[PDB]
Design an enzyme around this catalytic site. Structure first.
Site, PDB file in Angstrom:
ATOM      1  N   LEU A 122       4.240  -8.406  -3.143  1.00 30.04           N
ATOM      2  CA  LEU A 122       3.208  -8.693  -4.146  1.00 30.04           C
ATOM      3  C   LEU A 122       3.029  -7.628  -5.263  1.00 30.04           C
ATOM      4  O   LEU A 122       2.462  -7.932  -6.310  1.00 30.04           O
ATOM      5  CB  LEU A 122       1.905  -8.991  -3.416  1.00 30.04           C
ATOM      6  CG  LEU A 122       1.982 -10.325  -2.646  1.00 30.04           C
ATOM      7  CD1 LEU A 122       1.174 -10.337  -1.355  1.00 30.04           C
ATOM      8  CD2 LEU A 122       1.560 -11.477  -3.540  1.00 30.04           C
TER       9      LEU A 122
ATOM     10  N   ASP B  93     -14.726   2.896  -1.249  1.00 26.41           N
ATOM     11  CA  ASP B  93     -13.595   2.621  -2.151  1.00 26.41           C
ATOM     12  C   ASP B  93     -13.703   1.270  -2.854  1.00 26.41           C
ATOM     13  O   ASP B  93     -12.746   0.489  -2.871  1.00 26.41           O
ATOM     14  CB  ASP B  93     -12.254   2.736  -1.381  1.00 26.41           C
ATOM     15  CG  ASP B  93     -11.016   2.920  -2.309  1.00 26.41           C
ATOM     16  OD1 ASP B  93     -11.106   3.598  -3.353  1.00 26.41           O
ATOM     17  OD2 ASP B  93      -9.930   2.390  -1.973  1.00 26.41           O
TER      18      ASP B  93
ATOM     19  N   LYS C 157       0.814  -4.538   4.893  1.00 26.71           N
ATOM     20  CA  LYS C 157       0.768  -3.170   4.411  1.00 26.71           C
ATOM     21  C   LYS C 157       1.462  -2.325   5.475  1.00 26.71           C
ATOM     22  O   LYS C 157       1.033  -2.304   6.616  1.00 26.71           O
ATOM     23  CB  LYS C 157      -0.704  -2.798   4.241  1.00 26.71           C
ATOM     24  CG  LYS C 157      -1.012  -1.340   4.017  1.00 26.71           C
ATOM     25  CD  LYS C 157      -0.870  -0.969   2.562  1.00 26.71           C
ATOM     26  CE  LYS C 157      -1.166   0.507   2.305  1.00 26.71           C
ATOM     27  NZ  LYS C 157      -2.613   0.846   2.451  1.00 26.71           N
TER      28      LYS C 157
ATOM     29  N   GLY D 200       1.772  -0.037  -4.606  1.00 32.47           N
ATOM     30  CA  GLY D 200       0.648   0.895  -4.794  1.00 32.47           C
ATOM     31  C   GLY D 200       0.983   2.374  -4.715  1.00 32.47           C
ATOM     32  O   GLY D 200       1.470   2.963  -5.686  1.00 32.47           O
ATOM     33  N   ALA D 201       0.696   2.976  -3.563  1.00 32.79           N
ATOM     34  CA  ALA D 201       0.869   4.427  -3.368  1.00 32.79           C
ATOM     35  C   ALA D 201       1.168   4.855  -1.899  1.00 32.79           C
ATOM     36  O   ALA D 201       1.978   5.767  -1.678  1.00 32.79           O
ATOM     37  CB  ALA D 201      -0.337   5.176  -3.927  1.00 32.79           C
ATOM     38  N   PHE D 202       0.518   4.222  -0.910  1.00 35.65           N
ATOM     39  CA  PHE D 202       0.947   4.300   0.505  1.00 35.65           C
ATOM     40  C   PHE D 202       1.795   3.062   0.870  1.00 35.65           C
ATOM     41  O   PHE D 202       1.741   2.565   2.002  1.00 35.65           O
ATOM     42  CB  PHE D 202      -0.261   4.430   1.448  1.00 35.65           C
ATOM     43  N   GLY D 203       2.564   2.562  -0.104  1.00 29.89           N
ATOM     44  CA  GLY D 203       3.509   1.474   0.111  1.00 29.89           C
ATOM     45  C   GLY D 203       3.359   0.277  -0.815  1.00 29.89           C
ATOM     46  O   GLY D 203       2.588   0.277  -1.786  1.00 29.89           O
TER      47      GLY D 203
ATOM     48  N   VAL E 117       2.942  -4.086  -1.099  1.00 25.15           N
ATOM     49  CA  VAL E 117       2.170  -5.164  -0.499  1.00 25.15           C
ATOM     50  C   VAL E 117       3.133  -6.299  -0.175  1.00 25.15           C
ATOM     51  O   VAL E 117       3.821  -6.826  -1.058  1.00 25.15           O
ATOM     52  CB  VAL E 117       1.061  -5.690  -1.442  1.00 25.15           C
ATOM     53  CG1 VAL E 117       0.296  -6.832  -0.798  1.00 25.15           C
ATOM     54  CG2 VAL E 117       0.073  -4.597  -1.805  1.00 25.15           C
TER      55      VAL E 117
HETATM   56  C1  LIG Z   1      -5.177  -2.884   5.238  1.00 29.37           C
HETATM   57  O1  LIG Z   1      -4.387  -4.062   5.061  1.00 29.37           O
HETATM   58  C2  LIG Z   1      -4.084  -4.573   3.836  1.00 29.37           C
HETATM   59  C3  LIG Z   1      -2.866  -5.231   3.642  1.00 29.37           C
HETATM   60  C4  LIG Z   1      -2.584  -5.775   2.401  1.00 29.37           C
HETATM   61  C5  LIG Z   1      -3.510  -5.656   1.367  1.00 29.37           C
HETATM   62  C6  LIG Z   1      -3.243  -6.186   0.118  1.00 29.37           C
HETATM   63  C7  LIG Z   1      -4.188  -6.093  -0.903  1.00 29.37           C
HETATM   64  C8  LIG Z   1      -3.882  -6.598  -2.094  1.00 29.37           C
HETATM   65  C9  LIG Z   1      -3.674  -7.875  -2.455  1.00 29.37           C
HETATM   66  C10 LIG Z   1      -3.764  -9.026  -1.774  1.00 29.37           C
HETATM   67  C11 LIG Z   1      -3.258 -10.189  -2.382  1.00 29.37           C
HETATM   68  C12 LIG Z   1      -3.334 -11.423  -1.745  1.00 29.37           C
HETATM   69  N1  LIG Z   1      -3.937 -11.527  -0.479  1.00 29.37           N
HETATM   70  C13 LIG Z   1      -4.447 -10.381   0.134  1.00 29.37           C
HETATM   71  C14 LIG Z   1      -4.372  -9.147  -0.516  1.00 29.37           C
HETATM   72  N2  LIG Z   1      -3.369  -7.881  -3.735  1.00 29.37           N
HETATM   73  C15 LIG Z   1      -3.373  -6.619  -4.103  1.00 29.37           C
HETATM   74  C16 LIG Z   1      -3.119  -6.282  -5.329  1.00 29.37           C
HETATM   75  C17 LIG Z   1      -4.122  -5.632  -6.035  1.00 29.37           C
HETATM   76  C18 LIG Z   1      -3.896  -5.304  -7.354  1.00 29.37           C
HETATM   77  C19 LIG Z   1      -2.667  -5.642  -7.929  1.00 29.37           C
HETATM   78  S1  LIG Z   1      -2.350  -5.236  -9.549  1.00 29.37           S
HETATM   79  C20 LIG Z   1      -1.591  -6.597 -10.407  1.00 29.37           C
HETATM   80  O2  LIG Z   1      -3.690  -4.829 -10.190  1.00 29.37           O
HETATM   81  O3  LIG Z   1      -1.306  -4.107  -9.532  1.00 29.37           O
HETATM   82  C21 LIG Z   1      -1.667  -6.290  -7.208  1.00 29.37           C
HETATM   83  C22 LIG Z   1      -1.892  -6.626  -5.886  1.00 29.37           C
HETATM   84  C23 LIG Z   1      -0.894  -7.288  -5.158  1.00 29.37           C
HETATM   85  N3  LIG Z   1      -3.695  -5.795  -3.134  1.00 29.37           N
HETATM   86  C24 LIG Z   1      -3.795  -4.285  -3.213  1.00 29.37           C
HETATM   87  C25 LIG Z   1      -5.405  -5.432  -0.697  1.00 29.37           C
HETATM   88  C26 LIG Z   1      -5.671  -4.889   0.557  1.00 29.37           C
HETATM   89  C27 LIG Z   1      -4.720  -5.006   1.569  1.00 29.37           C
HETATM   90  C28 LIG Z   1      -5.007  -4.485   2.809  1.00 29.37           C
END
Ligand SMILES: COc1ccc2cc(-c3c(-c4ccncc4)nc(-c4ccc(S(C)(=O)=O)cc4C)n3C)ccc2c1
EC number: 2.7.11.1
Length: 268
Positions: free
Chosen positions: A19, A134, A42, A22-25, A27
């Site tokens: 998807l 956060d 994650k 980020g920074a600790f991996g 998505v």
């Molecule tokens: C502790 O376990 C987890 C595992 C995966 C996680 C993923 C996200 C997340 C998700 C997400 C998307 C769809 N369904 C669920 C989450 N999307 C994002 C995310 C946030 C911002 C952006 S962006 C375009 O601003 O760079 C992109 C993504 C994919 N995150 C960090 C957010 C929190 C997550 C926590």
């Protein structure tokens, strides 16, 4: 309970794609082999043993959070030196990502909903003696229905940071709410312009930040922002308190959101 060990998450989950990063991996998106459920994943390769031992508590907490506006954890695993975590798939994506996709900020009706729900979700946590530490657009997730799902993503600059917490107590989150609003309101938070170094200081000497184009928004909004963005932690209000404010006390329907999400499902 929920943290399995000596089961390879590949036996329970297939990965069907990424998807972002980020920074600790990265998505990952994931499909529960046996039950069909989609998840976002994650992965965390750990240096130390305590490092890990600590995340295991994080998670068993999230396990005890059954709320409609907080993500549910679908499984968690330590295996072959790494640790995977599988959260509920939110197919509306994160809010920040929508703004970047649509290239624009939220309307007030839309902010109103998000706020309403973040408040309800916060109240829950604080009432379970839990801090989030956060809050940001990026951790606010979306269903098609148009409900949020509050996400932790780990427990690196911090604009959403509270004053009492610098340079270095629920009330810290509330501040961070206020910023997030402004974030959604303008895509970027206050002092985006600055160097991560100077932010911290900037947040300290600076007055409470207000909205960039004030006559673009209501009385209810800013009057809400002003009272939430109190620099004293003590005179800053609680979740429940804010929930009684007119800006959000009237809000019953997520349509505003929902339509936003739908738009973004078409631009994609
Ligand atoms: C502790 O376990 C987890 C595992 C995966 C996680 C993923 C996200 C997340 C998700 C997400 C998307 C769809 N369904 C669920 C989450 N999307 C994002 C995310 C946030 C911002 C952006 S962006 C375009 O601003 O760079 C992109 C993504 C994919 N995150 C960090 C957010 C929190 C997550 C926590």
């Amino acid at each position: 309970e929920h943290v399995r060990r000596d089961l390879d998450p590949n036996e329970v989950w297939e990965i069907v794609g990424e998807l972002g990063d980020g920074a600790f991996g990265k998505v990952y998106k994931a499909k529960n082999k046996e039950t069909g459920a989609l998840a976002a994943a994650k992965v965390i390769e750990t240096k130390s043993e305590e490092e890990l031992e600590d995340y295991i508590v994080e998670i068993e907490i999230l396990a005890t959070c059954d709320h409609p506006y907080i993500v549910k954890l679908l499984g968690a695993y330590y295996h072959d030196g790494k640790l995977w975590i599988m959260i509920e798939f939110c197919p509306g994506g994160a809010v920040d990502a929508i703004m970047l996709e649509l290239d624009r900020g939220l309307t007030e009706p839309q902010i109103q909903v998000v706020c309403r729900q973040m408040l309800e979700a916060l109240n829950f946590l604080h009432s379970k003696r839990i801090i989030h530490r956060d809050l940001k657009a990026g951790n606010v997730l979306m269903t098609l229905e148009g409900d949020i799902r509050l996400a932790d993503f780990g427990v690196g600059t911090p604009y959403w940071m509270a004053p009492e917490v610098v340079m270095c107590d629920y009330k810290a989150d509330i501040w961070s709410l206020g910023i997030t609003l402004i974030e959604m309101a303008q895509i970027e938070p206050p002092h985006h312009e600055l160097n991560p170094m100077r932010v911290l200081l900037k947040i300290a000497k600076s007055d409470p930040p207000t909205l960039l184009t004030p006559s673009k928004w209501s009385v209810e909004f800013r009057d809400f922002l002003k009272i939430a963005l109190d620099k004293n932690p003590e005179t800053r209000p609680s979740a429940a308190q804010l929930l009684e404010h007119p800006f959000v006390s009237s809000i019953t329907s997520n349509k505003a959101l929902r339509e936003l999400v739908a738009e973004a499902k078409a631009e994609v």
